[PDB]
Design a protein around this ligand. Structure first.
Ligand SMILES: [Sr+2]
Ligand SMILES: [Sr+2]
Ligand SMILES: [Sr+2]
Ligand SMILES: [Sr+2]
Lengths: 1340, 57, 98, 157, 49, 341
């Protein structure tokens, strides 16, 4: 165990040992983006794939081209922390090496006066953060992975509502990664048709004729050919024994006189023996049998030169007689039946109106472009650019791999463009399935479904940006001069930057980071959605894709998915699953070598699983190799059944591979229903961090894995001994083992303190380590918002008693004690941003000074020196933050107002109050203020004094980093100096700056001091570089929107506490609303007198079918059962060895488990520090499936002197009488999630109205009105209500004259409507009149 | 007025214009759109006062 | 009584994506620990049943909208209608049960 | 129009020659025009946005749906204007006969036209200088806290 | 919000609601298919009055 | 009219115009050109082509989705034509019923109200003060507490102690409608007389919760307030929950106890083999409460109790039959809850 783990040992109730540990949870995001910025030569991945595809751009219109060499990145403008403050997009400038090539017409390729440019600006691409996110405009955003159909070839059946009877069809679909769609389908008339780019139906032979295939060549490729012969006037045929089987012959089948099958005789199997043995090659056939058959080749008269019969034509009695007249020897036909061979291609040729290649190319052009008449040059150009051009059509690396995989090919490698042989092979396989021999692939199969992450989706958006540029490049090459207009001026950076920015913060799969909790931060990054571009919409593909497919097993989580309209489209990625080399989903497996099981780990794709027999993790193993039982529950090729030991090829790694991270933290998932585990995983993501995070008593073991991988918690890069601890800075001295020669061994860990999130929650990094503690790599140094010591801590746990109350737990409702409010356990910190923008108008520019003509000095007491409110001022809903004034002009005073001005004296000329005020409600206090100014600067005194604070703090932040790094550098120098020449007392007296000149005799240690002296000068050099850059950013004139002078943003930290209305939920789906905060007096208590914290309804368990919350309650009191006995000790102070025996007994319960905690060999200092952490209960881990047993919890309950049943007798606080039945009391992990009652409560009587329609609208001061829909109208129509709906339609809605006249009646005390014409119908009347249709109102 | 509420609007408005139709406002859905009292419940006794005076006047 | 069956006794039989019922039902109840294969089997009906519920409100809501638009313009006109004619009403008996 | 076309040609040049973006201070130097001219044209050159521009969709909403009307006065303010005229009428009634007629002409209260000091003198029997005396006399009695407690509440605006 | 204006057309232009909307209000009134009306309106062929 | 198709300056400074304005310009432009071409030499080819687009210009203005498809001058979208204003799922004809915004309306998360009556709901204090805003000003100048409207506005914003007293006076006897989404039947909107409770959450009666499809876990309800005497009466006489105890679908009552109430009466009425106190004679149903809450007898066990039941007479009501019944202790206490008739 590590030192960070030794302070808090979690008792694991697992049985199966961990073979493969949990990997990096955000590996999908980081590894994929590094492919985009990868400098890979030939390995086409990311940017290098995008540039080399288009470039070198050539133009033979003016004989000139532009070439590509390599690209540059690095040098970011602002840091990840600096981007969030001043609102800058975190991106690195892309500069590409480009050179213009000039050709002269004399030699094949003659270059004259070549000009090369080093760096050309091509916009800037957003870089991924240290965790796995992008900072766009200031806010942190995530790119969601896309789930789509894999490029290659698909085969679909579709046998639903078709034709009339229900004829089963077969469809072949060639889908590329970039290009046009190829569809081959059969129609109700049995014929085959081709669809180009999913449009009109063309005959299947039209695509072959365009590929230069004659009518003779089309029939040659697919069909078997029967050869008829003309010998001595009579007609004969070449015989094949396989052709005549089952079908009754109407003629006498004879060979050289001998008759085998005569008129009115059937052929079975006996006759296919007599003809084979007698060496029969030629038989006599009548004129009737040949007539009706389809010819294959053209046969002309060799004496005249005229066409008798062309390819694909019906034969008759007269046509066969002319063939003997001409003098022909051979006739070639086709062999087509009704079962295994059919004339699908043959019958389409007659339907096909085209004659040659040119005719076919025009028909394709007319389908794609039905407007302009085509020429031969235009028709040939379009077809070659469809599926044969490299710049237009591409299968990519994965497409050709899967394309050759289904068609059964030798090679997996190939070109992106489809060849002429590839198109025929897809057509050949489609006929095979129609005949019989052929299988239909599944669309829902994960072996046919790919994952488009971040780097792959950004590559396609960058490629189309280059397509937008290449049009302007090649056209201007022949347009102008090639002597002056050379390098940079040719390519513009505007089209590139616009295409990239509309993807990172505008696309459907690019949303805000759901940073409610570290779990929601991780799960959102590994979300897989099938709603991206080139995928599926909300109302498409039916419900088949939404359903769980057996391939999901250990790749996609079956339970964790949105329960809304998406259900199935958006899915969570499982723990151990990763992306392979071709984008397919794969899950690790234990390799079994026919007997013994080895720790060999193999990642297998969805296609690979349908071959091997996979054993379940539920089975027990003998020793560590082979199985115990002969009959083992296994799964193979989709289905799952029992198998022998020798047939087993693979096994599951762990019993956690099927469930994703979001639902992995759920304690007793086995005892929960799949419907409520679906909901319970979603409730954990909405959880809001409490003021003080507390460890979960009933955990799983993944709590520690979530905290580290989230990136919100500060982890040690190297480790060693902690030198100085602060609530902002944690510095560490390296253990010298991982310290490499060159620089000082001190790492600075700067902590983010109180920062605003996307969901307005607080982000805080509290220190954990004490001064003088040894830690290593991977050790947790600081905790985030919802994390405890090393582990995840979502929303704390309270005392839970399942008992009915006096109607305060009617339906899902949950009670709370006053102690929950008194002790800050559910107090949530919310940081809010409020912006004040001074704007330039046509009347006059706006000012932001403390000169309010209306209020003063009452609200101006909070506001300080002419501008904004002071830092750290407690303000309530109504106080003024930024004093904004706006010029209005005119201000015509009414006769009555003119008198009022003369009586008292009033000053309100042009100056109108429009100041930034606190939203109407209850708010906290001001934390920080920021003022952004125009490019003309014109600094305000308040804006100038804060920049003085920004400069001095940044000076100290950079100076303190140098001081510590210098201290550790010269301390390392002393270690080198002492070793060899002992001067422990001599060097201390000498000044430390004169240590650089001193050194040992020129050896290997002299080279060691060479790097130390170089780094000292390097640290002093980079300090000046960082300070110059820091001074520039503060004094920099902030660029903003036009018509804006100054933007002031005042941040407020609201400390809102828990109250009735807030949404509380468990981990198993048990959600509820808080009824009433009851005092500690009336709430139930134990025999010893311990009051219960929260009371939850017991009725919402058997119908809900979630037993996981009950077993969490039983183990909850059991967890504190050990903790209370540790709490009973130490206070009285018992012996350390006496305390040591009880703790050792606690970690070893139930005879045999798995987790072996060190047998009391911890040091006296470590045991006492551990017992302090275990004082408030014992952390118990229960795995996802192989967790704590039902009998094991009862055994742990007896350790802490508690009943095995879990039910204890309680006393009522109000009466004092006993509850006539024992109630189950324990500890369940409760969650105070998002969308609280403070944000949900809205109320309006009167306010602002919209412009186009005169109905209520919300924006400032008062909230928006509630919509009265047509479903609510039916209710009032069903009731005898008439005057209430009259109110809803006129005075409460659109009627202009109605609302104001009615409002005055309320104040006067009249309560009368007096309704008129609503503006909803008044606009409608003018809209019909403007069309040209007379509509008028007629009287009585 | 009642038809164009849920049916196709352009077909109804063209049919009403050619034929020269008159909507006397008797249906419940007809009076909700124009902003008048419903010929049902409380407004039913109100509606009978105007329908009776169409024959005489 | 159907909910108590799954928790204490036996969960029962589950369905396949095609619509057919699986050969071997889940023997384990919610009192004891369910298997990895058994829980993955039970998820199908959970993500199919709730998927039907997501569009159940849209389908029944359209059915409510449908029946209104045809019958909304109907109110009571007279106190009594002068016809002694109606519908014959008999207790519904299916086979041999009321 | 010629200046807008001139802006786009130099914007392509200065973006890649310098590195980042042309600022109004730097853009004005190459155009040979003052900063107040360039920063003015940039606002005029922008095309008016469409009314039915979708923002986020989801529940289906357009840009023209969220635009509020500033022309409409608040029903609370409309009741204030009615209450002010009713209060002043009771206030003018407390004045001694002729004191109400002068203020209703000097400020145009309840009358269509506003009258000047010279116009009252010739149509009130009294002299020109006296009008200034009785005007302040009428105001002083309404400056008193006991009489005008209702009028002091309208001073909040 | 209530006042309207007018545009005087130099040439008579047909209404789309009475022409394209099935089964044509102008077509049924004159007993003439839409293909014959459009070719005249669009300026391709003459029609006898 | 220009107001229906407006050019308004936005908050930023960039203008916002209707798609109708862009369509109208491309009608007048070729209309002015045709007036020019008819007097400045008229070749048939050009004149017929100018008349060709002018016909299309009106066509695109009236109904754009018929002959071709016009593209906006700056945006890549089909323009909202005159026909597109009326139809299109959400327009002007269809928003008269569905897309209707309403004043004097609130919204909050529902909570339980066991102490409340059937005609009572637990409406929030800060919500009711905001909703009945004009109702406060009306009964504040009338009382003589506030001088004018502006003085009454300052008293409400400052949250004065006297305003809370007047607020309760206006709310009393004033019904308030409560709406839940979605409304399938008419009982989705029911009127309730509000009782002021401090908090941001609205409390609902457990019995009427059976009428809605509501569960206290994260559901929200709309709070509508009637204004006129006619609106107040048709809320009490028709839309009140006490008046609507039965369902309109069937003769069976919709307001029926569930969950906690059923479990409470089930335990009270059920009998045990031999509980505390059995075989007593008991004087009235009042002595049954004397034994249980004191601690001498349990609710169960078959104990003889003296009861006085009143049956319905032919005319009503004189029948008063008293007899010894063999029930339990818990059954006798519940008889006191049961009415005489
Ligand atoms: Sr790990
Ligand atoms: Sr006189
Ligand atoms: Sr319910
Ligand atoms: Sr719900």
């Amino acid at each position: 165990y590590s030192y960070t783990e030794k302070k808090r040992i979690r008792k694991d109730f697992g049985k199966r040992p961990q073979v493969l540990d949990v990997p990096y949870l955000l590996s999908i995001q980081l590894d994929s983006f590094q492919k985009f910025i990868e400098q890979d030569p030939e390995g086409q991945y990311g940017l290098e794939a995008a540039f080399r595809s288009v470039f070198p751009i050539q133009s033979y219109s003016g004989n000139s081209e532009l070439q590509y060499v390599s690209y540059r990145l690095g040098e970011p403008v602002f840091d990840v922390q600096e981007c969030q403050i001043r609102g800058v997009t975190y991106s690195a400038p892309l500069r590409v090496k480009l050179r213009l090539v000039i050709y002269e017409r004399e030699a094949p390729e003659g270059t004259v006066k070549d000009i090369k440019e080093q760096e050309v600006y091509m916009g800037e691409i957003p870089l991924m953060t240290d965790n796995g996110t992008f900072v766009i405009n200031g806010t942190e955003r995530v790119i969601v992975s896309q789930l789509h159909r894999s490029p290659g070839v698909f085969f679909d059946s579709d046998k639903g509502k078709t034709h009339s009877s229900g004829k089963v069809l077969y469809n072949a679909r060639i889908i590329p990664y970039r290009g046009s769609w190829l569809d081959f389908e059969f129609d109700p008339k049995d014929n085959l048709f081709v669809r180009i780019d999913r449009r009109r139906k063309l005959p299947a032979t039209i695509i072959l004729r365009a590929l230069n295939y004659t009518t003779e060549q089309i029939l040659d490729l697919f069909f078997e050919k029967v050869i008829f012969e003309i010998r001595d006037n009579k007609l004969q045929m070449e015989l094949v024994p396989e052709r005549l089987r089952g079908e009754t012959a109407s003629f006498d089948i004879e060979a050289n006189g001998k008759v085998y099958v005569e008129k009115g005789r059937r052929i079975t199997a006996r006759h296919i023996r007599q003809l084979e043995k007698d060496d029969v090659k030629l038989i006599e056939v009548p004129v009737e049998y040949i007539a009706g058959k389809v010819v294959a080749k053209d046969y002309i008269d060799e004496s005249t030169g005229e066409l008798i019969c062309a390819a694909n034509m019906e034969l008759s009695l007269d046509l066969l007689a002319k063939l003997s007249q001409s003098g022909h020897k051979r006739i070639e036909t086709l062999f087509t039946n009704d079962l295994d061979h059919g004339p699908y291609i043959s019958e389409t040729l007659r339907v096909d109106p085209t004659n040659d290649r040119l005719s076919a190319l025009v028909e394709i052009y007319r389908m794609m472009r039905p407007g302009e008449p085509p020429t031969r040059e235009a028709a040939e150009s379009l077809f070659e650019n469809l599926f044969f051009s490299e710049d237009r059509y591409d299968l990519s690396a994965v497409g050709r791999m899967k394309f050759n995989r289904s068609l059964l090919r030798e090679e997996i490698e190939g070109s992106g463009i489809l060849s002429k042989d590839d198109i025929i092979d897809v057509m050949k396989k489609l006929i095979d399935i129609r005949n019989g021999k052929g299988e239909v692939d599944d669309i829902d199969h994960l072996g046919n479904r790919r994952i488009r992450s971040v780097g792959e989706m950004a590559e396609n958006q960058f490629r189309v940006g280059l397509v937008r540029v290449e049009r302007a490049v090649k056209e201007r090459l022949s347009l102008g001069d090639l002597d002056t207009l050379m390098p940079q001026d040719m390519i513009n950076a505007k089209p590139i930057s616009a295409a990239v920015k509309e993807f990172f913060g505008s696309s459907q799969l690019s949303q805000f980071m759901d940073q409610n909790n570290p779990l929601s931060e991780i799960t959102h990054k590994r979300r897989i959605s099938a709603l991206g571009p080139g995928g599926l919409t909300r109302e498409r593909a039916g419900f088949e894709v939404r359903d769980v497919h057996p391939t999901h097993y250990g790749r996609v989580c079956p339970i964790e998915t949105p329960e809304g309209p998406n259900i199935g489209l958006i899915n969570s990625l499982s723990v151990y699953a990763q992306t392979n080399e071709y984008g397919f989903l794969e899950t690790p497996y234990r390799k079994v070598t026919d007997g013994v099981v080895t720790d060999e780990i193999h990642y297998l794709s969805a296609i690979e699983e349908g071959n091997y027999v996979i054993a379940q993790a539920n089975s027990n193993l003998d020793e560590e190799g082979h199985f115990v039982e002969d009959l083992v529950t296994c799964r193979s090729k989709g289905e799952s059944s029992l198998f022998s030991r020798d047939q087993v090829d693979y096994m599951d790694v762990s019993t956690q591979q099927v469930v994703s991270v979001g639902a992995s933290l759920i304690p007793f998932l086995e005892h929960d229903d799949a419907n409520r585990a679906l909901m319970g995983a979603n409730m954990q993501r909405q959880a809001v961090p409490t003021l003080r995070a507390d460890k979960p008593l009933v955990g799983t073991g993944m709590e520690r894995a979530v905290a580290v991988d989230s990136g919100v918690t500060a982890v040690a890069k190297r480790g060693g001994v902690v030198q100085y601890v602060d609530a902002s800075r944690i510095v560490i001295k390296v253990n010298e083992d991982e310290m490499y020669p060159g620089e000082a061994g001190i790492d600075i860990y700067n902590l983010t303190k109180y920062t605003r999130s996307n969901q307005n929650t607080c982000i805080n990094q509290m220190p954990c380590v004490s001064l003088g503690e040894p830690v290593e790599r991977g050790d947790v140094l600081a905790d985030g918002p919802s994390t405890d010591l090393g582990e995840l801590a979502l929303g704390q746990n309270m005392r839970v008693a399942f008992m009915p109350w006096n109607g305060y737990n009617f339906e899902d409702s949950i009670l709370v004690s006053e102690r929950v409010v008194q002790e800050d356990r559910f107090t949530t910190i919310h940081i809010q941003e409020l912006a004040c923008v001074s704007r330039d108008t046509k009347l006059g520019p706006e000012e932001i000074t403390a000169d309010i003509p209306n209020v003063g000095e009452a609200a101006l007491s909070k506001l300080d020196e002419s501008g904004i409110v002071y830092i750290g001022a407690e303000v309530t809903g109504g106080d003024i933050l930024v004093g904004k004034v706006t010029p209005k002009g005119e201000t015509q005073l009414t006769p009555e107002e003119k008198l009022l001005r003369a009586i008292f004296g009033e000053k309100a000329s042009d100056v109108k109050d429009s100041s930034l005020r606190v939203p109407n409600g209850v708010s906290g206090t001001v934390i920080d203020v920021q003022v952004f100014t125009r490019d003309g600067v014109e600094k305000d005194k308040r804006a100038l004094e804060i920049e003085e604070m920004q400069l001095k703090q940044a000076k100290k932040d950079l100076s303190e980093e140098l001081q510590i790094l210098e201290a550790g550098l010269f301390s390392r120098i002393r270690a080198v100096l002492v070793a060899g020449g002992v001067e422990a007392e001599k060097l201390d007296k000498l000044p430390r700056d004169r240590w650089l000149e001193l050194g040992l005799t020129d050896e290997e240690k002299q080279n060691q001091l060479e790097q130390l002296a170089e780094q000292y000068d390097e640290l002093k050099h980079e300090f000046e570089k960082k300070l110059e850059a820091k001074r520039r950013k503060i004094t920099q004139g902030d660029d903003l929107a036009p018509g804006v002078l100054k933007i002031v943003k005042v941040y407020l930290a609201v400390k809102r506490r828990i109250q009735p209305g807030d949404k509380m939920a468990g981990r198993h789906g048990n959600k509820g609303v808080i009824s009433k905060i009851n005092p500690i007096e009336d709430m139930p208590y134990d025999e010893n007198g311990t009051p219960v914290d929260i009371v939850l309804n017991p009725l919402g368990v058997p119908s809900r079918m979630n037993i996981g919350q009950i077993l969490e309650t039983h183990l909850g009191m059991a967890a504190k059962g050990i903790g209370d006995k540790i709490n009973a000790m130490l206070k009285q102070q018992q012996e350390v060895a006496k305390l040591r025996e009880f703790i050792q007994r606690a970690y070893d319960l139930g005879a045999d488990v798995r987790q072996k905690v060190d047998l009391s060999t911890f040091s006296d200092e470590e045991v006492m520090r551990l017992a302090e952490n275990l004082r408030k209960g014992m952390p118990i881990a229960t795995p996802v499936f192989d967790g704590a047993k039902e009998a094991e919890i009862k055994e742990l309950l007896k350790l802490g002197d508690l009943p095995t049943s879990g039910q204890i007798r309680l006393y009522d606080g109000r009466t004092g009488e006993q509850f006539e039945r024992p109630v189950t009391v324990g500890y369940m992990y409760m969650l105070k999630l998002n969308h609280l009652v403070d944000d949900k409560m809205h109320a309006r009587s009167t306010g602002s109205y919209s412009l186009v329609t005169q109905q209520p609208l919300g924006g400032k001061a008062q909230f928006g009105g509630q919509r009265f829909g047509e479903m609510e109208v039916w209710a009032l129509e069903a009731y005898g209500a008439a005057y209430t709906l009259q109110e809803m339609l006129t005075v409460k809605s659109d009627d202009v004259n109605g609302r104001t006249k009615m409002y005055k009646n309320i104040v006067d005390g009249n309560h009368q409507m007096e309704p008129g014409m609503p503006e909803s119908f008044n606009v409608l009347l003018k809209e019909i009149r403007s069309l040209g249709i007379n509509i008028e109102l007629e009287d009585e | 007025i009642s038809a164009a509420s849920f049916q196709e609007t352009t077909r109804v408005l063209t049919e009403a214009a050619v034929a020269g139709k008159r909507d006397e406002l008797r249906g419940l859905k007809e009076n909700v759109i124009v902003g008048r009292l419903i010929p049902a419940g409380t407004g039913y006794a109100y509606h009978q006062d105007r329908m009776r005076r169409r024959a005489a006047g | 009584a159907a909910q108590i069956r799954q928790l204490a006794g036996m969960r029962g039989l589950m369905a396949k994506p095609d619509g057919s019922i699986i050969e071997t039902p889940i023997t384990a109840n919610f009192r004891e620990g369910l298997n990895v294969l058994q829980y993955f089997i039970s998820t199908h009906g959970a993500r199919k049943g709730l998927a039907d519920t997501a569009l159940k409100t849209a389908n029944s809501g359209y059915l409510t909208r449908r029946l209104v638009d045809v019958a909304q313009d109907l109110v009571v006109t007279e106190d009594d209608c002068g016809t002694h004619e109606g519908i014959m009403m008999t207790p519904v008996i299916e086979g041999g049960d009321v | 129009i010629e200046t807008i076309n001139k802006l786009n040609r130099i914007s392509r040049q200065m973006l890649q020659e310098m590195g980042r973006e042309p600022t109004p201070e730097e853009l004005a130097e190459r155009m040979l025009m003052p900063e107040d001219k360039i920063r003015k044209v940039l606002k005029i050159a922008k095309e008016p946005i469409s009314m039915e521009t979708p923002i986020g969709d989801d529940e289906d909403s357009h840009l023209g749906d969220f635009i509020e009307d500033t022309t409409l006065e608040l029903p609370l303010d409309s009741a204030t204007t009615e209450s002010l005229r009713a209060a002043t009428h009771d206030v003018l009634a407390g004045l001694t006969a002729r004191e109400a007629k002068v203020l209703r002409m000097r400020f145009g209260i309840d009358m269509n036209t506003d009258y000047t000091l010279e116009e009252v003198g010739k149509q009130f029997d009294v002299t020109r200088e006296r009008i200034r005396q009785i005007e302040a006399k009428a105001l002083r009695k309404l400056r008193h806290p006991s009489r005008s407690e209702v009028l002091r509440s309208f001073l909040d605006d | 919000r209530e006042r309207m204006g007018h545009i005087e057309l130099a040439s008579p232009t047909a209404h789309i609601w009475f022409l394209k909307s099935l089964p044509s209000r102008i077509g049924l009134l004159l007993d003439m298919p839409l293909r014959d009306i459009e070719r005249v309106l669009y300026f391709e062929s003459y029609v006898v009055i | 009219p220009p107001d229906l198709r407006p050019l308004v300056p936005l908050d930023g400074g960039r203008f916002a115009t209707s798609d109708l304005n862009d369509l109208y310009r491309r009608v007048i432009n070729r209309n002015n050109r045709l007036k020019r071409l008819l007097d400045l030499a008229a070749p048939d080819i050009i004149v017929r082509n100018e008349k060709r687009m002018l016909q299309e210009a009106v066509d695109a203005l009236l109904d754009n989705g018929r002959r071709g498809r016009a593209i906006t001058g700056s945006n890549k979208r089909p323009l909202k034509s005159l026909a597109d204003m009326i139809k299109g799922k959400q327009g002007r004809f269809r928003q008269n019923l569905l897309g209707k915004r309403v004043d004097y309306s609130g919204r909050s998360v529902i909570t339980v109200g066991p102490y409340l009556r059937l005609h009572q709901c637990g409406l929030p204090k800060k919500m009711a003060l905001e909703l009945f805003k004009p109702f406060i000003y009306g009964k504040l100048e009338l009382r003589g507490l506030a001088t004018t409207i502006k003085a009454a506005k300052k008293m409400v914003e400052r949250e004065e102690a006297v305003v809370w007293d007047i607020l309760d006076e206006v709310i009393r006897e004033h019904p308030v409608l409560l709406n839940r989404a979605p409304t399938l039947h008419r009982l989705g909107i029911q009127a309730f007389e509000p009782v002021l409770i401090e908090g941001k959450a609205i409390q609902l009666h457990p019995l009427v919760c059976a009428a809605y499809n509501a569960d206290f876990d994260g559901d929200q309800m709309a709070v509508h307030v009637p204004l006129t005497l006619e609106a107040q009466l048709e809320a009490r006489a028709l839309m009140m929950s006490t008046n609507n105890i039965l369902s309109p679908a069937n003769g069976e009552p919709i307001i029926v106890p569930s969950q906690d109430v059923v479990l409470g009466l089930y335990y009270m009425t059920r009998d045990c083999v031999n509980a505390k106190g059995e075989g007593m004679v008991l004087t009235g149903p009042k002595e049954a409460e004397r034994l249980y809450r004191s601690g001498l007898a349990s609710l169960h066990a078959r104990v003889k109790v003296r009861i006085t039941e009143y049956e319905k007479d032919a005319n009503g009501e004189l029948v008063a039959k008293t007899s010894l019944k063999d029930t339990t202790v818990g059954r006798a206490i519940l008889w006191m809850i049961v009415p005489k008739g």
